[PDB]
Amino acid sequence: PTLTIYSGRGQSLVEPLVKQFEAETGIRVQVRYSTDAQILAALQEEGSRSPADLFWANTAGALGQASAKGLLRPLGETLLEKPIAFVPASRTWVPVTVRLRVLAYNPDRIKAEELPESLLDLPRFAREKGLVGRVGWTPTYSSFQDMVAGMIALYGEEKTREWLLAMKALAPKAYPSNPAMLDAIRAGEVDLGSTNHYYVVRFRRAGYRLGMHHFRDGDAGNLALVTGAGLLKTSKNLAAATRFLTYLLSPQAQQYFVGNIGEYPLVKGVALDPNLLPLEEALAKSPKLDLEKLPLDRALRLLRETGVL
Amino acid sequence: PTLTIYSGRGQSLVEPLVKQFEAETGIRVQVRYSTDAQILAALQEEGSRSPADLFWANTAGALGQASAKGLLRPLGETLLEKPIAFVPASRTWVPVTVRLRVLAYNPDRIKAEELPESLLDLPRFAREKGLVGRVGWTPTYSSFQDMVAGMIALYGEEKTREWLLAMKALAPKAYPSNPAMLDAIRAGEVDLGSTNHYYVVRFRRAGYRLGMHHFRDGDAGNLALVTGAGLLKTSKNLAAATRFLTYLLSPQAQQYFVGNIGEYPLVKGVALDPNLLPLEEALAKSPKLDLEKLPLDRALRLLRETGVL
């Protein structure tokens, strides 16, 4: 017998936690690593004969799909009472960490106080600072796509399309990863880029003074990016899988998420990092959306039609 | 309940952990942030305006000085049995984390399999590979000076002098901090430099895949840099102070050191980092010196007299 996790989270993040869990509990664990979307597909393709016990996803939207598609078991109050925020109405999965969209910038070139209060205002701001050809983005990156989906949810397709086309008119540089983009900010090739907060945290911990800008509370540019896990209906190892979800919400595992990964924890009693906001301040930043139901479908359509993807 | 800590560890490291300890226990913690050397001066000679409970030091050498001066309470088997290694011969403080001297290099530009087995042979390697002006060091940095002290213990001053003079013949570049030197390694100003392992870890976590060369087991260039904490003879808050010492060895605190700081833990119940060695491998690297008794003053004198410092 082995606990089987299907993970849309990265191996360099998952593996050390799994190894610790194996050592402490004596439970053998096997992990499959794919994208959230590939995991969702495989879980459906495998039907009743899936060996899968848990789905540990990079995104609330993938868990929302798994739930809506009847893959997930309802969770009890013991697990669902643990997180401080983001517990789905479906009560079929548990949020484990949250990450924030932020605006990274070079603080030698831009004063914090002149930065825009809204993402929608970013293209005008970039033209104010003469930044045509001097802004970066990551059009193929999952969280950027999530952010565009939140824009649709808040503002509608037309305003979101308008923004995409305005962004394209800035001649932005596209980077295949967030560290590539942040390196370009450090080098002075671009002066700003929308990214995930923990990439900026990692650069700062390494000694690079990269600016971390938050838009006004509730702005689409601060979208909350919730990760989480659910138990599958197919699970034949429910006690081990419950033990594992418990482990993911423990102070120790949560300290790993904060420290090793740079993400915000969702339980209290975790030591933060001077580069992170207090938890209550972090929770204030995102629009209050149904994160299970972001219109990623419509986001990809717009990104394709506008020439971003 | 209250607790006074004299910390030679940086505020950016100590503060988040102390805040969580306060929140968790209701013990009000007061911290003095200073250097290990300034704290020693206070504990042996200069005095305090109020009694301190704990010396949380950056270095085993400073705790060893405090011990030699008789300023630390003896600890016994109940506290000292938790750490896996590095319990001091004096048994007057508890080891909390370990860091390793390593050789940072740019793996795009340097072939790992060609790097020397001993720090002593670095100047020859560098001269042969035509790397004059392309080696960096941090002459003013505490851990560099510790490594030089390890050299004096292992080799004597005459051998250490030769090495220092052979180094100087490479026209090495001097950097005010480890991040500055690692940035120069990334940028291409130099190709390698002796540093502490966690600086390389932080660079790798940010996406800059700098190399971490370890010398052969026992080599002076792999010196173990142990951090730790001792109870002072002046301690008025003995209950809170012993509770904190226990806390520093707890799974959550140890996870914080691995994650937030990048150091090696000294307990087994912790999730590591794919950029760290397994624990036993890290334990093999350093020579087996009495870390409480390194000739730090001789190292300082020698660095000043060879004009390195």
XYZ file of C-alpha atoms in Angstrom:
618
model
C 0.000 0.000 0.000
C 1.121 3.527 -0.878
C -0.512 6.939 -0.714
C -0.774 8.292 -4.302
C -0.796 12.067 -4.882
C -1.562 13.593 -8.270
C 0.183 16.959 -8.085
C -0.201 20.063 -10.199
C 2.390 21.636 -7.925
C 6.060 21.464 -8.861
C 8.300 18.621 -7.819
C 10.962 20.910 -6.254
C 8.211 22.225 -3.964
C 6.381 18.938 -3.254
C 9.236 16.427 -2.912
C 10.848 17.691 0.330
C 7.479 17.732 2.089
C 6.673 14.219 0.878
C 10.079 12.930 2.006
C 9.586 14.474 5.463
C 6.076 12.965 5.708
C 7.377 9.542 4.723
C 10.144 9.699 7.362
C 7.883 10.851 10.187
C 4.793 8.676 9.545
C 6.195 5.567 7.875
C 3.557 5.901 5.089
C 5.032 5.321 1.613
C 4.002 8.014 -0.858
C 4.139 8.085 -4.687
C 3.640 11.228 -6.665
C 2.657 12.032 -10.224
C 3.688 15.544 -11.409
C 1.860 17.347 -14.250
C 0.094 20.658 -14.918
C -3.257 21.172 -13.147
C -4.942 20.792 -16.551
C -3.147 17.501 -17.370
C -3.993 16.150 -13.902
C -7.678 17.038 -14.399
C -7.675 15.213 -17.719
C -5.930 12.088 -16.417
C -8.215 11.823 -13.390
C -11.213 11.781 -15.737
C -9.499 9.355 -18.219
C -8.682 6.890 -15.416
C -12.242 6.908 -14.010
C -12.887 4.301 -11.257
C -9.478 2.573 -11.736
C -7.370 5.622 -10.797
C -4.910 4.728 -8.037
C -5.107 8.467 -7.070
C -5.860 9.454 -3.459
C -5.347 13.230 -3.389
C -5.274 16.028 -5.948
C -2.849 18.727 -4.825
C -3.333 21.607 -7.211
C -1.507 24.822 -8.005
C -4.848 26.673 -8.448
C -8.247 27.107 -6.820
C -9.685 27.041 -10.358
C -8.389 23.513 -10.995
C -9.891 22.378 -7.669
C -13.164 24.114 -8.576
C -13.192 22.148 -11.883
C -12.417 18.866 -10.062
C -15.252 19.561 -7.628
C -17.722 20.613 -10.320
C -16.817 17.501 -12.288
C -17.639 15.184 -9.343
C -14.068 14.035 -8.597
C -13.813 15.230 -4.981
C -15.095 14.016 -1.612
C -16.641 16.500 0.869
C -14.299 17.330 3.749
C -15.131 17.375 7.446
C -15.138 20.411 9.698
C -11.790 19.581 11.308
C -9.872 20.256 8.108
C -12.150 23.046 6.853
C -11.978 25.006 10.094
C -8.153 25.330 9.865
C -7.587 27.952 7.125
C -8.119 31.615 7.772
C -9.669 32.302 4.389
C -10.587 30.896 0.953
C -12.439 27.764 1.978
C -14.687 26.830 -0.940
C -18.485 26.934 -0.555
C -18.413 23.423 -2.123
C -16.426 22.324 0.958
C -14.778 19.715 -1.262
C -11.170 20.883 -0.899
C -8.982 22.791 1.485
C -6.902 25.919 0.635
C -3.274 25.436 1.725
C -1.419 28.620 0.658
C -2.142 31.925 -1.050
C 0.069 33.968 -3.379
C -0.615 37.442 -4.754
C -0.253 39.120 -8.082
C 2.006 42.181 -7.575
C 3.821 44.766 -9.640
C 7.568 44.326 -9.581
C 9.637 47.365 -10.480
C 13.135 48.847 -10.252
C 13.007 51.328 -7.323
C 16.053 53.159 -8.660
C 13.969 54.161 -11.667
C 10.423 54.444 -10.346
C 9.239 56.151 -7.142
C 6.763 53.975 -5.234
C 4.311 56.904 -4.788
C 3.845 57.531 -8.532
C 2.861 53.922 -9.293
C -0.768 53.422 -10.474
C -3.525 52.404 -8.035
C -5.069 50.163 -10.691
C -3.885 47.564 -13.188
C -6.219 49.082 -15.820
C -4.239 52.302 -15.489
C -0.898 50.571 -16.059
C -0.665 51.176 -19.837
C -1.170 54.960 -19.359
C 1.404 54.900 -16.533
C 3.946 53.098 -18.727
C 3.499 55.790 -21.421
C 3.846 58.485 -18.713
C 7.265 57.026 -17.832
C 8.374 56.588 -21.501
C 8.381 52.811 -21.155
C 7.350 51.712 -24.649
C 9.374 48.522 -25.267
C 10.404 48.695 -21.586
C 7.724 46.650 -19.777
C 7.807 42.855 -19.313
C 5.146 40.187 -19.031
C 4.770 36.442 -19.106
C 1.799 35.762 -21.416
C 2.093 31.943 -21.227
C 2.291 31.803 -17.410
C -0.692 30.302 -15.554
C -1.027 33.055 -12.936
C -0.895 35.812 -15.515
C -3.769 34.051 -17.267
C -5.613 33.788 -13.951
C -5.147 37.521 -13.523
C -6.690 38.219 -16.956
C -9.623 35.928 -15.992
C -10.162 38.034 -12.823
C -10.177 41.144 -15.011
C -13.004 39.622 -17.025
C -14.898 38.734 -13.840
C -14.561 42.302 -12.464
C -14.729 44.501 -15.573
C -16.158 42.419 -18.449
C -14.629 41.214 -21.719
C -14.531 44.558 -23.537
C -12.582 46.459 -20.900
C -10.240 43.453 -20.515
C -9.767 43.274 -24.315
C -9.051 46.983 -24.327
C -6.396 46.467 -21.714
C -4.770 43.558 -23.539
C -4.588 45.498 -26.785
C -3.190 48.532 -24.926
C -0.561 46.322 -23.354
C 0.344 44.969 -26.839
C 0.638 48.576 -28.100
C 3.423 49.126 -25.532
C 5.667 46.663 -27.416
C 6.194 44.649 -24.223
C 8.939 42.044 -23.880
C 7.677 38.508 -23.229
C 9.651 36.269 -20.867
C 9.285 32.459 -20.616
C 9.517 32.655 -16.803
C 9.085 35.074 -13.932
C 12.707 34.814 -12.849
C 13.708 35.666 -16.452
C 11.503 38.802 -16.280
C 12.800 39.824 -12.836
C 16.372 39.406 -14.098
C 15.457 41.742 -16.939
C 14.152 44.283 -14.366
C 17.466 43.950 -12.432
C 19.449 44.429 -15.687
C 17.384 47.491 -16.691
C 16.027 45.940 -19.910
C 12.447 46.433 -18.613
C 11.448 48.613 -15.614
C 8.367 46.725 -14.420
C 6.301 43.562 -14.776
C 3.235 41.944 -13.194
C 4.300 38.774 -11.375
C 3.627 36.554 -8.318
C 4.727 38.030 -4.938
C 7.031 35.156 -4.049
C 9.287 35.689 -7.054
C 10.013 39.230 -5.756
C 10.467 37.804 -2.234
C 13.098 35.362 -3.564
C 15.015 38.149 -5.331
C 14.983 40.295 -2.172
C 16.145 37.448 0.058
C 19.047 36.975 -2.355
C 19.978 40.658 -1.875
C 18.373 42.336 -4.928
C 16.347 45.445 -4.017
C 13.323 44.859 -6.272
C 10.235 46.959 -5.643
C 7.020 45.217 -4.647
C 3.961 47.280 -5.606
C 0.382 46.472 -4.547
C -2.552 48.112 -6.333
C -5.473 49.485 -4.282
C -7.322 46.851 -2.201
C -9.654 44.839 -4.383
C -7.905 45.689 -7.674
C -7.600 42.963 -10.370
C -3.792 43.494 -10.310
C -3.670 41.943 -6.771
C -5.528 38.748 -7.564
C -5.208 36.050 -4.848
C -3.786 32.773 -6.244
C -4.930 30.029 -3.861
C -3.340 26.531 -3.872
C -5.034 23.564 -2.215
C -5.858 19.898 -2.094
C -8.855 17.561 -2.133
C -9.485 13.856 -1.484
C -10.631 11.903 -4.497
C -13.736 9.703 -4.544
C -11.419 7.008 -5.971
C -9.245 6.931 -2.811
C -8.619 3.536 -1.231
C -6.225 5.114 1.306
C -8.495 7.674 2.980
C -6.840 7.618 6.403
C -3.318 8.235 4.984
C -4.658 10.948 2.626
C -6.468 12.715 5.482
C -3.276 12.444 7.543
C -1.440 14.095 4.646
C -3.927 16.982 4.236
C -3.600 17.494 7.980
C 0.179 17.644 7.586
C -0.146 20.283 4.827
C -2.023 22.589 7.286
C 0.339 21.987 10.221
C 2.501 24.839 11.546
C 5.582 23.048 10.375
C 4.438 22.482 6.768
C 3.039 25.996 6.676
C 6.442 27.305 7.805
C 7.957 25.410 4.867
C 5.545 27.167 2.469
C 6.483 30.544 3.931
C 10.235 29.890 4.136
C 11.245 27.409 1.461
C 8.701 28.662 -1.113
C 7.899 32.280 -0.059
C 4.080 31.861 -0.157
C 1.614 33.164 2.420
C 0.357 30.590 4.913
C -3.366 30.202 5.628
C -3.005 29.133 9.243
C -2.092 31.354 12.179
C 1.041 30.790 14.237
C 3.556 30.791 11.388
C 6.625 33.049 11.478
C 6.514 35.318 8.498
C 9.339 37.024 6.613
C 10.101 40.753 6.617
C 9.389 40.802 2.826
C 5.799 39.580 3.324
C 2.788 41.598 4.448
C 1.092 40.711 7.732
C -1.559 38.108 6.882
C -4.558 40.428 7.388
C -2.947 42.949 5.019
C -2.274 40.253 2.398
C -5.889 39.055 2.570
C -7.113 42.628 1.988
C -5.340 42.947 -1.388
C -7.356 40.689 -3.735
C -10.804 41.318 -5.201
C -13.422 39.158 -3.446
C -14.083 36.716 -6.283
C -15.267 33.131 -6.463
C -11.805 31.744 -7.157
C -13.282 28.316 -8.050
C -15.126 30.002 -10.949
C -12.662 32.418 -12.646
C -13.437 32.591 -16.389
C -10.129 31.136 -17.580
C -11.976 29.857 -20.629
C -12.864 33.403 -21.706
C -9.393 34.647 -20.680
C -7.586 32.326 -23.081
C -10.025 33.325 -25.879
C -9.273 37.003 -25.416
C -5.530 36.366 -25.075
C -5.604 34.516 -28.396
C -7.800 36.989 -30.323
C -5.682 39.987 -29.172
C -2.385 38.378 -30.166
C -1.003 38.024 -26.658
C -0.877 34.235 -26.950
C 6.286 36.520 31.845
C 9.190 38.167 30.028
C 12.480 37.274 28.341
C 15.550 39.285 27.360
C 17.710 38.041 24.485
C 21.081 39.459 23.410
C 21.248 38.405 19.761
C 24.301 38.438 17.553
C 22.001 37.078 14.858
C 20.459 39.671 12.538
C 17.098 41.251 13.239
C 15.741 40.223 9.823
C 16.324 36.606 10.924
C 15.429 36.787 14.640
C 12.436 39.103 14.678
C 9.869 36.966 12.782
C 10.601 33.928 14.939
C 10.521 35.894 18.233
C 7.162 37.468 17.221
C 5.650 34.033 16.658
C 7.058 32.797 20.004
C 5.447 35.777 21.778
C 2.101 35.241 20.059
C 2.157 31.518 20.856
C 3.218 31.755 24.514
C 2.228 35.239 25.754
C 5.812 35.762 26.909
C 6.945 39.315 26.200
C 10.361 39.083 24.503
C 12.903 41.932 24.459
C 15.777 41.651 22.040
C 19.075 43.536 21.809
C 20.528 43.285 18.290
C 24.267 43.626 18.103
C 27.367 41.789 16.886
C 28.673 38.634 18.594
C 31.822 40.617 19.516
C 29.892 43.625 20.951
C 27.725 41.215 22.960
C 30.765 39.428 24.353
C 32.243 42.790 25.379
C 29.061 43.549 27.314
C 28.885 40.089 28.946
C 32.543 40.005 30.097
C 33.434 43.645 30.845
C 31.088 46.454 29.798
C 27.994 45.214 31.724
C 24.234 45.739 31.050
C 21.556 48.181 32.287
C 19.253 45.159 32.816
C 20.077 41.422 33.107
C 19.963 39.382 29.870
C 18.580 35.796 29.856
C 20.073 34.313 26.665
C 22.941 34.926 24.274
C 21.775 33.868 20.819
C 24.994 34.003 18.882
C 25.845 33.812 15.185
C 28.992 31.786 15.924
C 30.172 28.855 18.036
C 33.390 30.827 18.577
C 31.570 33.630 20.397
C 29.642 31.124 22.554
C 32.969 29.421 23.233
C 34.451 32.733 24.395
C 31.472 33.301 26.698
C 31.894 29.743 27.988
C 35.654 30.145 28.573
C 34.935 33.344 30.508
C 32.431 31.412 32.683
C 29.376 33.500 31.657
C 27.091 30.613 30.605
C 25.103 28.250 32.786
C 25.891 24.575 32.330
C 23.292 22.629 30.379
C 22.760 18.918 30.675
C 21.456 15.873 28.838
C 17.793 16.972 28.686
C 18.517 19.916 26.429
C 21.667 18.669 24.773
C 20.315 15.352 23.527
C 18.029 16.920 20.848
C 20.714 18.230 18.410
C 22.135 15.601 15.987
C 25.648 17.075 16.062
C 27.866 19.986 17.179
C 27.107 19.956 20.910
C 29.975 21.913 22.437
C 32.664 20.234 24.511
C 31.911 22.782 27.240
C 28.231 21.722 27.318
C 27.298 25.348 28.114
C 25.172 26.137 25.039
C 22.901 24.470 22.578
C 23.726 24.284 18.850
C 20.745 25.409 16.745
C 21.732 25.500 13.060
C 24.828 24.872 11.001
C 26.046 26.606 7.859
C 28.862 25.483 5.609
C 31.655 27.260 3.876
C 31.391 26.304 0.167
C 32.935 27.404 -3.103
C 30.366 29.344 -5.187
C 30.930 29.216 -8.949
C 29.122 30.003 -12.173
C 28.362 26.597 -13.679
C 27.925 28.140 -17.154
C 31.556 29.235 -17.039
C 33.300 26.693 -14.765
C 33.324 22.897 -15.084
C 32.547 21.432 -11.632
C 34.592 18.279 -12.263
C 37.743 20.371 -12.726
C 37.448 22.273 -9.429
C 40.084 21.344 -6.777
C 39.567 18.882 -3.948
C 41.052 21.300 -1.438
C 40.797 25.027 -0.831
C 44.624 24.968 -0.532
C 44.862 24.140 -4.225
C 42.521 26.875 -5.386
C 45.284 29.351 -6.308
C 46.946 26.738 -8.543
C 43.659 25.888 -10.235
C 42.947 29.564 -10.826
C 46.407 30.315 -12.194
C 46.270 27.260 -14.502
C 42.808 28.082 -15.787
C 43.887 31.660 -16.440
C 41.548 33.144 -13.869
C 43.754 35.986 -12.594
C 41.405 38.808 -11.570
C 38.431 36.347 -11.840
C 38.282 35.117 -8.220
C 36.429 37.033 -5.490
C 36.586 37.013 -1.686
C 35.033 38.857 1.265
C 37.973 39.759 3.514
C 35.870 41.656 6.114
C 33.174 38.976 6.482
C 32.935 37.143 9.859
C 32.631 33.640 8.322
C 35.553 34.171 5.983
C 37.570 35.048 9.063
C 36.262 31.923 10.803
C 37.458 29.838 7.829
C 40.907 31.448 8.090
C 40.875 30.582 11.846
C 40.080 26.943 10.945
C 43.080 27.046 8.644
C 45.376 28.219 11.428
C 44.090 25.417 13.649
C 44.531 22.789 10.975
C 47.695 24.017 9.295
C 49.420 26.683 11.416
C 49.981 30.347 10.472
C 52.902 29.707 8.075
C 50.905 27.369 5.847
C 47.867 29.730 6.090
C 50.059 32.756 5.228
C 51.368 30.958 2.129
C 47.794 30.264 1.020
C 46.804 33.877 1.631
C 49.833 35.141 -0.290
C 49.131 32.659 -3.144
C 45.518 33.945 -3.225
C 46.672 37.587 -3.344
C 48.885 36.740 -6.343
C 45.666 36.084 -8.350
C 44.620 39.754 -7.993
C 41.390 38.575 -6.364
C 38.525 41.075 -6.207
C 37.255 42.118 -2.762
C 33.526 42.403 -2.084
C 31.825 44.102 0.837
C 29.125 41.403 1.133
C 28.368 37.848 -0.064
C 25.422 38.971 -2.209
C 27.753 41.473 -3.913
C 30.237 38.693 -4.658
C 27.532 36.294 -5.879
C 26.137 39.054 -8.100
C 29.629 39.493 -9.622
C 29.776 35.723 -10.184
C 26.443 35.862 -12.028
C 27.472 38.986 -13.945
C 30.835 37.564 -15.054
C 33.201 39.873 -13.183
C 34.560 36.819 -11.307
C 33.915 33.074 -11.685
C 34.184 31.763 -8.136
C 34.442 32.671 -4.447
C 34.333 31.041 -1.025
C 31.059 31.897 0.723
C 28.415 30.469 3.125
C 26.182 27.878 1.559
C 22.863 29.600 2.249
C 23.848 32.587 0.090
C 24.093 30.235 -2.849
C 20.798 28.632 -1.827
C 19.054 32.011 -1.909
C 20.488 32.744 -5.372
C 19.323 29.320 -6.663
C 15.816 29.769 -5.156
C 15.548 33.058 -7.081
C 16.369 31.300 -10.376
C 20.120 32.029 -10.654
C 21.531 28.544 -10.723
C 24.986 29.245 -9.206
C 27.054 26.176 -8.288
C 27.895 24.926 -4.798
C 31.251 23.143 -4.767
C 32.226 21.237 -1.668
C 35.846 20.340 -1.091
C 36.865 16.844 0.072
C 35.445 15.871 3.468
C 37.404 17.505 6.258
C 38.886 20.236 4.083
C 39.372 23.686 5.706
C 37.300 25.212 2.876
C 34.240 23.337 4.174
C 34.319 24.749 7.740
C 31.098 24.192 9.776
C 29.684 27.524 11.027
C 27.485 26.625 13.977
C 24.964 29.029 15.504
C 23.548 28.553 18.995
C 22.224 29.923 22.248
C 23.274 29.802 25.902
C 21.701 30.759 29.231
C 23.445 33.556 31.032
C 24.495 33.552 34.713
C 22.510 36.842 34.952
C 19.214 35.219 33.762
C 16.255 36.342 35.874
C 13.639 34.707 33.636
C 14.881 31.116 33.780
C 11.539 29.508 32.932
C 10.977 31.656 29.823
C 14.660 31.341 28.784
C 14.710 27.505 28.990
C 11.315 27.390 27.225
C 12.807 29.475 24.391
C 15.879 27.221 24.089
C 13.529 24.239 23.720
C 11.545 26.192 21.152
C 14.636 26.846 19.034
C 15.009 23.066 18.548
C 11.274 22.569 17.740
C 10.082 21.328 14.295
C 8.530 24.681 13.454
C 11.556 26.784 14.425
C 13.944 24.409 12.683
C 11.766 24.612 9.577
C 11.986 28.392 9.743
C 15.783 28.194 9.749
C 15.849 25.870 6.730
C 13.165 27.782 4.861
C 13.293 31.460 5.758
C 17.099 31.539 6.223
C 18.383 28.590 4.176
C 20.515 27.033 6.947
C 20.915 23.346 7.886
C 18.723 22.229 10.789
C 20.196 20.222 13.703
C 17.119 18.028 14.170
C 15.802 15.269 11.892
C 12.087 16.196 11.696
C 12.412 18.954 9.022
C 11.599 19.277 5.291
C 14.829 20.119 3.471
C 15.429 21.970 0.218
C 16.493 20.460 -3.061
C 19.402 22.975 -2.945
C 20.639 21.477 0.362
C 22.732 18.349 0.937
C 21.068 15.563 2.943
C 21.955 16.049 6.633
C 24.594 13.335 6.890
C 26.366 14.633 3.826
C 26.461 18.138 5.320
C 27.857 16.711 8.574
C 30.709 15.051 6.642
C 32.020 18.235 5.076
C 33.795 20.123 7.879
C 37.044 19.236 9.649
C 36.487 18.030 13.223
C 37.767 21.091 15.053
C 36.618 22.275 18.456
C 34.461 25.128 17.117
C 34.382 26.827 20.560
C 38.144 27.293 20.364
C 39.029 28.518 16.868
C 41.976 30.982 16.833
C 39.894 33.876 15.521
C 42.248 36.552 16.889
C 45.240 34.955 15.162
C 43.192 34.848 11.924
C 42.376 38.563 12.219
C 46.027 39.391 12.895
C 47.206 37.314 9.949
C 44.638 38.819 7.538
C 45.681 42.332 8.590
C 49.428 41.560 8.346
C 49.147 39.937 4.890
C 47.175 43.019 3.763
C 44.125 40.929 2.843
C 42.217 42.814 5.540
